[PDB]
């Protein structure tokens, strides 16, 4: 059962010396700051970043790499519709149109297989897929390792 407070726990845990000792981290104890989940500074001091990744996908599709794109359908930060428009703009052809994939007897999400890329959504999952839909997230992962389309 879901606990929306996990970051808190993590903050406490990785801050023990016990643990850092066990991880071979901040060995000399020289990390002159508390351990944090993200770095604010970094976050607020970013420089270069292209506006589009589309060109790179094109290069790697042409290169023949296996490329899967997924989406937790209840995230509002980088939502599913943003991904539908961006992938739609690659202009690839469709091999298998949008269809429902099952895990057991429940619909796990939807999928679309294009020539060179597979699009997968995860039903009911938020931004952190393996947290929200752990089980469906493992299926997702196994199929990709195999290069097999989402089932059912």
């Amino acid at each position: 059962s879901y606990d929306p407070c996990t970051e808190r726990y993590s903050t406490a845990y990785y801050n023990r010396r016990d643990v850092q000792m066990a991880l071979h981290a901040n060995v000399t104890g020289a990390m002159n700051y508390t351990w944090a989940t993200c770095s604010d500074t970094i976050n607020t001091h970013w420089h270069d970043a292209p506006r589009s990744m589309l060109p790179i996908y094109r290069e790697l599709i042409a290169a023949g790499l296996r490329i899967w794109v997924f989406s937790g359908d209840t995230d509002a930060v980088v939502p599913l519709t943003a991904t539908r428009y961006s992938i739609g703009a690659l202009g690839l052809p469709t091999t298998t149109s949008w269809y429902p994939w099952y895990d057991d007897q429940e619909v796990g999400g939807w999928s679309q297989v294009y020539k060179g890329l597979t699009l997968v959504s995860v039903r009911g999952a938020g931004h952190e897929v393996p947290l929200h839909r752990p089980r469906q997230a493992l299926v997702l992962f196994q199929y990709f390792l195999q290069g097999k389309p989402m089932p059912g």
Partner: protein
């Protein structure tokens, strides 16, 4: 390598797979060293593929998220008292490597304090590449293993930029088969158009705010919005209320 091995973590339950964590120096000049966490698959599953997992932000820790509250082998207990095993951990089928990146994130550090005010996509990728090339020297039984790169959010940038590098490098010990991205940035213009549409479509903003957002942000970058975009976005934040924007229908932590 054997030196990087983990015996046991505090509060850790007993497991049947090995784990390794430590640093790799990607910049001896600057003194930039990245921390990794490798959670291997069980013997019977070997030899399994190698998966590099990257978290986004930019500025967020793959160990903090990926390994601890997502796909990693364990989950942390309230109060940070111990660990519990993840029944759906990805290291059941693959060797998962979690990289804290860039330098200054998580356990990852830099010896040049300026380093943390000047991060960008380009240097993040180059350091990431360096890390992989030496990591394979520390772990030579990993050469030639089918390798995949994966991530979330701002890793929509990281994953493909790094894959690009790996590919053009032509390093013969790196057997890159592909990559996978979850909920990530792809194209600034399209993502903005889609974000706003989905929001209005989930009842989280007004008709006016929706129109203001489209008109304020379409020419912007996600990472560097203009002041018109920020203004627009501040109204929306106020219309959204106290919700978990990362998961619309689950509770907020108190």
């Amino acid at each position: 390598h054997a030196a990087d091995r983990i015996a046991r973590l505090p509060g850790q339950p007993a497991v049947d797979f090995d784990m390794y964590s430590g640093y790799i120096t990607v910049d001896e000049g600057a003194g930039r060293s990245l921390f990794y966490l490798l959670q291997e698959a069980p013997e019977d599953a070997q030899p399994a593929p190698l998966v590099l997992w990257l978290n986004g932000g930019p500025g967020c820790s793959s160990v903090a998220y990926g390994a601890s509250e997502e796909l990693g082998a364990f989950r942390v207990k309230p109060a940070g008292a111990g660990l519990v095993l993840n029944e759906y951990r990805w290291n059941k089928v693959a060797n998962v490597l979690f990289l804290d990146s860039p330098a200054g994130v998580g356990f990852s550090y830099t010896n040049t304090s300026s380093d943390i005010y000047t991060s960008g996509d380009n240097r993040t990728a180059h350091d990431s590449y360096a890390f992989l090339a030496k990591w394979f020297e520390r772990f030579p039984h990993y050469k030639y293993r089918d390798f995949y790169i994966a991530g979330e959010s701002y890793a929509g940038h990281y994953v493909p930029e790094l894959s690009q590098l790996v590919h053009r490098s032509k390093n013969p010990v790196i057997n890159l088969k592909g990559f996978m991205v979850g909920n990530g940035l792809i194209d600034d213009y399209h993502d903005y158009v889609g974000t706003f549409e989905f929001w209005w479509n989930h009842g989280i903003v007004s008709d006016d705010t929706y129109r203001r957002l489209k008109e304020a942000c379409l020419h912007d970058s996600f990472i560097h919005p203009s002041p018109a975009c920020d203004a627009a976005t501040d109204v929306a934040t106020a219309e959204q209320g106290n919700i978990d924007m990362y998961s619309l229908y689950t509770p907020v932590c108190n």
